[PDB]
């Protein structure tokens, strides 16, 4: 669901990308894939965010579609960052 | 460069996804990754396009970032489809 935080269930990639922010329209969430922005821990366009789960770089430039089956159940609500997220996506595509 | 068609140099995935349409802002193309929409042949949100290279489904829902090193030199100009492409991306994210 849009702007929800999910844990990355893909064990290989989870060390680098422990969470995903879902950025897909809810109208399309019967698809088998989900457009997401990966988060990477700061310890390892791309704002820094501080959420209950830790401190992350939101890697907008690595936005990607993933199989829905690699998403956990919802972990946290990041709808509060929705305008920052949409601005980052708009920057990636438009340069503005 | 934005709305350029590139061949997918990743030999494994090229049978299913022979080409990518680059959708990233040109202002950001010094990054080592590029936001792209994959094309899959019709023989194998997602408009059908007919271009010099063949007939493809534009797989907007599988939009992803790829390493710049898996892109060929430019193959074709798809700037003519730019409004269709931006509309598809807007649909994926906004449902409108």
From TrEMBL, chains A, B:
Keywords annotated in UniProt: Repressor, Transcription, Transcription regulation
Source taxon at top rank: Bacteria
Assigned protein family: Belongs to the CcdB toxin family.
Segments traversing the membrane: none
Biological processes per GO annotation: plasmid maintenance
GO molecular function ontology, one term from the record: DNA topoisomerase type II (double strand cut, ATP-hydrolyzing) inhibitor activity
Entry protein name: Toxin CcdB
One Pfam family it belongs to: CcdB
Organism: Aliivibrio fischeri (Vibrio fischeri)
Phylogenetic lineage: Bacteria, Pseudomonadati, Pseudomonadota, Gammaproteobacteria, Vibrionales
């Amino acid at each position: 669901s849009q702007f929800t935080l999910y844990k990355n269930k893909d064990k290989s990639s989870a060390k680098t990308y422990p969470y995903f922010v879902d950025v897909q329209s809810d109208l399309l969430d019967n698809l088998n894939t989900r457009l997401v922005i990966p988060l990477t821990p700061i310890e390892l366009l791309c704002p820094t965010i501080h959420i209950d789960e830790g401190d992350f770089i939101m890697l907008t430039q690595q936005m990607t579609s993933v199989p829905v089956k690699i998403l956990s159940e919802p972990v946290n609500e990041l709808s509060t960052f929705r305008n920052e997220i949409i601005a980052a996506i708009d920057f990636l595509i438009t340069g503005i």
